[PDB]
Symmetry: C2
Subunit: 304 residues, 2 copies
Amino acid sequence: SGFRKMAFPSGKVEGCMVQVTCGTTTLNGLWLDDVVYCPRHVICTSEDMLNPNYEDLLIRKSNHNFLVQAGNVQLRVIGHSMQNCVLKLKVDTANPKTPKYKFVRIQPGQTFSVLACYNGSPSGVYQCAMRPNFTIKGSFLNGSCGSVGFNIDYDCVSFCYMHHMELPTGVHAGTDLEGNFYGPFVDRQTAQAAGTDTTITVNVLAWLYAAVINGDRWFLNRFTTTLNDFNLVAMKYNYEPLTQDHVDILGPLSAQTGIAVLDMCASLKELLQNGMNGRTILGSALLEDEFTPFDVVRQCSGVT
Amino acid sequence: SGFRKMAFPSGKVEGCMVQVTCGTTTLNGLWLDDVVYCPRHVICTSEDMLNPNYEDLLIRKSNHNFLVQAGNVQLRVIGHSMQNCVLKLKVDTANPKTPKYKFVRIQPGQTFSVLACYNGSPSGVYQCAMRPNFTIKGSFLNGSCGSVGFNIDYDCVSFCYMHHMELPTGVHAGTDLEGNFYGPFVDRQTAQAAGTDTTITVNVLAWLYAAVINGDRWFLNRFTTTLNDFNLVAMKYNYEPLTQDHVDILGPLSAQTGIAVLDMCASLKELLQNGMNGRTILGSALLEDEFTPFDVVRQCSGVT
């Protein structure tokens, strides 16, 4: 019993973190096979970041200007290329700790673990979600760029995020491992404001199922609703519209608990309209939206 | 910027988890040097757990009855002993991945990371605190016993917790790595009720400092207080008494922010008396007490 914000075990990713230095900039890289992946802004001065021309800045860089250190051992850079907003540094040594891996581009509402790193050294691991406005709410200090987000399926690491940017509002932006930003963000120190950070409805519903499984039941009510009726209320409260696809995804939790998805929507509707009245659900005073239905099933079933 | 509930990177501990089976019971063990540590209740049937005589049950067990598996490889058990509520299984192979380590017994209010495991396989990592009633609020399913709690200081793992028990109220009890339960709990399926789960005041104050550092400032008010005045209010709200030792520990965060500890106590006093009025602090609608002052300094400074 109990339900925690849980990250994947980080060891497989710890084995891939390296330090990348270009001139006076140090950040983190991800070493998979004989390629180190890092943010292309490693080549920028903070001055450069105001209006960088990355192709032009990169012309002034050679393989020997990219200093890659794995623990206390230097890696030899034998090639470099820019793919979107990441650099791929080809090294002469395959990472002996390379796990089975995939690069995946996640959808808003999907969760992942972040291994926050500084100077190629892991500092901590925490759980994030891709927000509906394609930001994440992370914990990243100067030096954390190139820290990665991932999911694990048994022994395969799916890398989904690399940290690039903090917005003036203190939320975070980054790329997939092909170097494409999530959302509209750019690797430039400019006016970038995030859109509405809506609540991930299907994740709240999943977490309410987790609450019922773990004995927190006070919020269950005598009501039901329809998707359209629920969505009128979701819209008013800046919740994401619930789709039949979301209802289908919640089916296993519905089955496990015997609470119909639309009954749980009616419980959520009352919580939105009535508030928590000073009560908590799984130790939270707000409706938690950074557990996916898959997360809830995984944690409630004990997948390794 | 940003402030997350962050666990230590788990890799060093992942390298120590093994499966222990005795008859029909499978749980987790911790393999350090040539010793595997596990809960002594591995030797119990669920029937046994109602009133176990561990010395008597252990007489019926031989080295060859303790099946220890590290990944898909069997370890040879060459001795076994009971120390308090843990078994120490001596194996013929030192764990080649043994990190630098210590066994520490933590105080209530101290935080640690848990690597939840099933069948010796890591499932997830999350951050816990030793509650003032010597329970923890974990996420543990059947098979999770022997999962461990730890802190890391650079490259040294301090193991502080091993999971043994779930109370009928769904909170968790366990031991240090000498096999001594935290608090009054026993490894028996009996009436064990937890005492008051008071709020860890010094940790709330630390987290309010973290909030100010990360730009959440709305709760700062024009007031101050005294330890005695604050403590009258703490007592009323089931907060732990704040001591001068706690004030001394918050000194570095006081210095960093320029907010005197007693001024922050007066902000906390108003939050207790007035509530949050539907506002949040670092994404929480309640006052978070599972960050120590050391955690806040570590996460705000980026220690690896």
